[PDB]
Amino acid sequence: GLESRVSALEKTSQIHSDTILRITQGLDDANKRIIALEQSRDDLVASVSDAQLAISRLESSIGALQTVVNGLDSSVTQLGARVGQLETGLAELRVDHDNLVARVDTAERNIGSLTTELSTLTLRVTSIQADFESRISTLERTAVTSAGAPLSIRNNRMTMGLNDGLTLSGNNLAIRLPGNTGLNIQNGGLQFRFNTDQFQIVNNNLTLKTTVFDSINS
Amino acid sequence: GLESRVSALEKTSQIHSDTILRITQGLDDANKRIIALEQSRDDLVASVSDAQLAISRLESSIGALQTVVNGLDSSVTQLGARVGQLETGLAELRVDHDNLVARVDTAERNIGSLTTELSTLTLRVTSIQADFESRISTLERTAVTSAGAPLSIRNNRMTMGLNDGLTLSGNNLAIRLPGNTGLNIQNGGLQFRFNTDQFQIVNNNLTLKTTVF
Amino acid sequence: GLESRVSALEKTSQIHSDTILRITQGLDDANKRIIALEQSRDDLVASVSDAQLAISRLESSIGALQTVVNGLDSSVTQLGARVGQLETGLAELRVDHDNLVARVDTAERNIGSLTTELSTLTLRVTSIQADFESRISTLERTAVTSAGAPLSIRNNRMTMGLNDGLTLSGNNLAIRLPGNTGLNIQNGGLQFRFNTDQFQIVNNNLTLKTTVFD
């Protein structure tokens, strides 16, 4: 009856008491685990906040590096064009210098050639001047350029003027003896001629012979 | 009395059972949600640790790359100075070459004139030598340089030496006949003169005239 | 007895009601804190995921930049080698040009000395030509190169041909009178001689003296 209803309550009350104590232990365990979770949350928020700032710094550093590198790339491209032209320019100036060196090599050979050719010609002029000076001089000292009477010169020709009594016989000067007056060229020269029965020569004087008048005296 | 007290206890006891069951249900659900949070927490810790390590590596590699980019920047600057010096040096040498070319241009033009003027002078010396050689030798072959007696040369003048018997009549050679000895220049030359009543000529001999009785 | 048991149950029933309410308050506190942790967890997942995505992007950028930088380093090295070859080349051309400048410096001095020597010789040749021309043509105009008889030239020597009657007394032209014929060179020239007791000269005529007949 009423004792049965009380006994049933006491039975349930003991179960309620045991279950309440178990729920309390479980709720205490859940609370501790929540605190540990809130601590982990705070640690994670701080680590993530630090990681986010570090990432932002890395993005600034990388972005600044990319621009510096981009600049370096253009400068290297400009220097590559400048070295390329410098190698072309130096190759051209070397070809131009070598072509000029060949021209100087030819000019040095032509200068040396003119030096000996002029030396030969200067020596030749000295040789001709000396030989001709000596030859002209010999002629000037020894050639006949004037003459005294009976000789005369007209246009490089010398002639001899002769008066009557002197003439040319063959190629020679001779004594002219016209007619017959007792003069003759004989016995190597000029001789006088006389009748040898009438005349004689005594002391180189014409003399009448001693016997001339013998026929008259007889 | 007790029936009402027990009845009240029974009513509260039934409410307690129902609330206890709902609380157990709630605690069970809270426990399941705590487990999921602990697992999520473990996964976050692992991923944050991995993120920190990766950041640390990015910091190291950016730093090393900055050092290399700094070294590259200085090299590009040093090369830029060297290139500009080479560009000036080549432009200076091209000017110095072009000026020396102009000096060779005149030298080549001066050699060409010297070669021409020497060639004309050589032909002139040959021309002068041949003309004078012929003229001198003609004079050396034909000119009178000596003479035999009665001719003599003194200071380029030729004279004729004359003995008594030969003289000048004007500028002509003549026979000298001093005084009157019967010799005379007449009838075109030398003749002997005699009295024509006392002498005659027979075979070019002076003869006494026959009519002298 | 039974009333003592009822009173024991009532006391326990009130303790149960009070603890149930405290557990209800505790469980409610737990649920609020769980909801907040779940939302914080969702935000952390989103923020960690954003950070992981940002990290992988930086890793790609660093990898790509390192590639470019190594290429640039390779490019600067080759350039530095070309620059060094250009420097040794320009220094070689400068030496070669300055050695040619010295060769042109001596060649110009040689050309100048050769212009002087050729100019001096040209004037000298003209002087020799003018002096010799005058002297030669003076000899050509005045020198004796031919002679009329009795003068004759043989090998630049002039002689005079003489017939009998003409000879030489030393270097002088003389009349030759062989033997004793009455002719003699006396009183400055040619005279005829005669016996002055038998002959006389009257009007330059040989005459017999009157005394010869007596």
Render A148-208 in DSSP notation, one character per residue. Answer: -TTEEEETTEEEE-B-TTEEEETTEEEE---S-SSEEEETTEEEE-B-TTTEEEETTEEEE
A13, A89, A165: residue with CB nearest B174: A165
Closest Cα to residue A150, out of B94, B172, B69? B172
In sign, the C-alpha dihedral spanning C9, C12, C18, C21 is negative
Residues whose CB falls within 8 Å of the CB of residue A87, separated by 6 or more in sequence, listed in order: C82, C86
Q: Give the strand order in the sheet containing B151-154.
A: A146-147, B157-160, B151-154
The method of structure determination was X-ray
Which residues of chain C does B149 touch, with a Cβ-Cβ cutoff of 8 Å? 168, 170-172
C20, C121, C187: residue with CB nearest B19: C20
Q: Taking a C-beta distance cutoff of 8 angstroms, is the pair A188, C176 a contact?
A: yes
Using DSSP's 3-state secondary structure scheme, residue A126 falls into helix
Q: How many CB atoms lie within 10 A of CB C151?
A: 24
Closest Cα to residue A204, out of B181, C176, C193? C193
Give all chains having 3 or more CB-to-CB distances under 8 Å with chain A.
Answer: B, C
Q: Any chain C CB within 8 A of the CB of B12?
A: yes
Give strand ranges (E) for chain A: 146-147, 151-154, 157-160, 166-169, 172-175, 183-186, 189-192, 199-202, 205-208
The hierarchical CATH code for the domain C180-214 is: 2.10.25
DSSP B93-131: HHHHHHHHHHHHHHHHHHHHHHHHHHHHHHHHHHHHHHH
B69, B108, B111: residue with CB nearest A65: B69
Please give the Cα distance from A90 to A182 (Å, whole number): 120
Task: Quote the tokens at residue A105.
Answer: 């090599």
Using DSSP's 3-state secondary structure scheme, residue B42 falls into helix
Q: Any chain C CB within 8 A of the CB of B16?
A: yes
Task: Name the one residue in this structure whose structure tokens are 């907040």.
Answer: C36
Helix and strand tally (H, E) in chain C? Answer: 1, 9
Q: How many CB atoms lie within 10 A of CB A69?
A: 17
Please give the Cα distance from A187 to C177 (Å, whole number): 9
> Which residues are registered as beta bridge partners of B173?
A162, B168
* Residue A46 CA to its chain's centroid (Å): 86
| Enclosing H/E stretch for C195 | none
Residues within 8 A of C (CB atoms), A 132-171 only = 132, 136, 139-140, 143-145, 147, 151, 153, 156-160, 168-171
Q: How many CA atoms lie within 13 A of B87 on its CB side?
A: 12
The hierarchical CATH code for the domain B179-213 is: 2.10.25
Please give the Cα distance from A193 to A185 (Å, whole number): 10
Which residues of chain C does A141 touch, with a Cβ-Cβ cutoff of 8 Å? none
> Which residues are registered as beta bridge partners of A196?
none
Using DSSP's 3-state secondary structure scheme, residue C191 falls into strand
In sign, the C-alpha dihedral spanning C115, C120, C121, C122 is positive
Please give the Cα distance from A140 to C125 (Å, whole number): 22
Please give the Cα distance from C28 to A31 (Å, whole number): 11
CB burial of residue A159 (10 Å; 0-12, 13-18, 19+): middle
User: What single DSSP character describes residue C129?
Assistant: H
Q: Taking a C-beta distance cutoff of 8 angstroms, is the pair A139, C139 a contact?
A: yes
Please give the Cα distance from C26 to A208 (Å, whole number): 225
In a mutagenesis test of the B interface, which of A164, A184, A199, A216 is the best target, namely the one with the most B β-carbons within 10 Å?
A164
Task: Give me Rg for the CA atoms of chain B.
Answer: 81
Please give the Cα distance from A36 to A41 (Å, whole number): 9
User: What single DSSP character describes residue C193?
Assistant: -
Task: Quote the tokens at residue B29.
Answer: 């659900």
Q: Any chain B CB within 8 A of the CB of C212?
A: no
Residues whose CB falls within 8 Å of the CB of residue B146, separated by 6 or more in sequence, listed in order: A142, B153, C156, C157, C158
> C158 CA to chain B: closest CA distance, Å?
5
Residues within 8 A of B (CB atoms), A 61-120 only = 61-62, 65, 68-69, 72, 75-76, 79, 82-83, 86, 89-90, 93, 96-97, 100, 103-104, 107, 110-111, 114, 117-118
Task: Name the one residue in this structure whose structure tokens are 């954003």.
Answer: C50
Query: To one decimal place, what's the resolution in Å?
Result: 2.2
User: What single DSSP character describes residue C211?
Assistant: G
> Which residues are registered as beta bridge partners of A24?
none
> C99 CA to chain B: closest CA distance, Å?
12
Q: Any chain C CB within 8 A of the CB of B30?
A: yes
Residues whose CB falls within 8 Å of the CB of residue A108, separated by 6 or more in sequence, listed in order: C103, C107
Helix, strand, coil shares of chain C, percent, nearest 5, are 65, 15, 15
Please give the Cα distance from B62 to B68 (Å, whole number): 10
A171 to C148: CB separation less than 8 angstroms, yes or no: no
Q: How many CA atoms lie within 13 A of B115 on its CB side?
A: 12
Closest Cα to residue C6, out of B15, A3, B17? A3
C51, C73, C187: residue with CB nearest B178: C187
Q: Taking a C-beta distance cutoff of 8 angstroms, is the pair C190, B176 a contact?
A: yes
Label the pairing between strands C172-175 and C166-169: antiparallel
Helix and strand tally (H, E) in chain B? Answer: 1, 9
Q: Any chain A CB within 8 A of the CB of B122?
A: yes
> Which residues are registered as beta bridge partners of C40?
none
Q: Any chain C CB within 8 A of the CB of A2?
A: yes
User: What single DSSP character describes residue A212?
Assistant: T
A166-176: string of b/e by CB count within 10 Å (b at 16+)?
Answer: bbbbeebbbbb
Task: Give me Rg for the CA atoms of chain C.
Answer: 82
> A57 CA to chain C: closest CA distance, Å?
11
User: What single DSSP character describes residue C210?
Assistant: G
Task: Quote the tokens at residue C35.
Answer: 């909801």
Residues whose CB falls within 8 Å of the CB of residue C154, separated by 6 or more in sequence, listed in order: none
